[PDB]
């Protein structure tokens, strides 16, 4: 809510917490992607050998 002062003053905190959660999840997905790429490279080398 924003029609009063308290609504905005508490909207600030709720938005901060939401952003924290979003950023942590994005970091985790990036880590997964890196690991999968490394697995692919190793598989290709072993198959050639």
């Amino acid at each position: 809510d924003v029609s009063t002062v308290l609504g905005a003053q508490q909207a600030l905190e709720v938005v901060d917490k939401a952003l924290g959660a979003i950023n942590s999840t994005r970091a985790d997905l990036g880590a997964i992607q890196n690991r999968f790429t490394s697995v692919v490279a190793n598989l290709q080398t072993s198959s050639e050998n």
């Binding site: 490394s38 190793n42 080398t45 072993s46 050998n49």
Partner: protein, 49 residues
């Protein structure tokens, strides 16, 4: 004498094959070690931050 020479030749060819198999084993082992090393390097680069 000719049978002795025959036995020697027949042994020599399979010896060649066995040596080649040893080469293949060494190749595979080195192939895996290289990837282990790359991952360790990345961890160190992350941790100096």
């Amino acid at each position: 004498i000719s049978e002795r020479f025959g036995t020697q030749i027949r042994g020599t060819d399979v010896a060649i094959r066995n040596a080649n198999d040893g080469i293949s084993l060494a190749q595979v082992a080195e192939g895996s070690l290289t990837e282990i090393g790359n991952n360790l390097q990345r961890v160190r680069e992350l941790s100096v931050q």
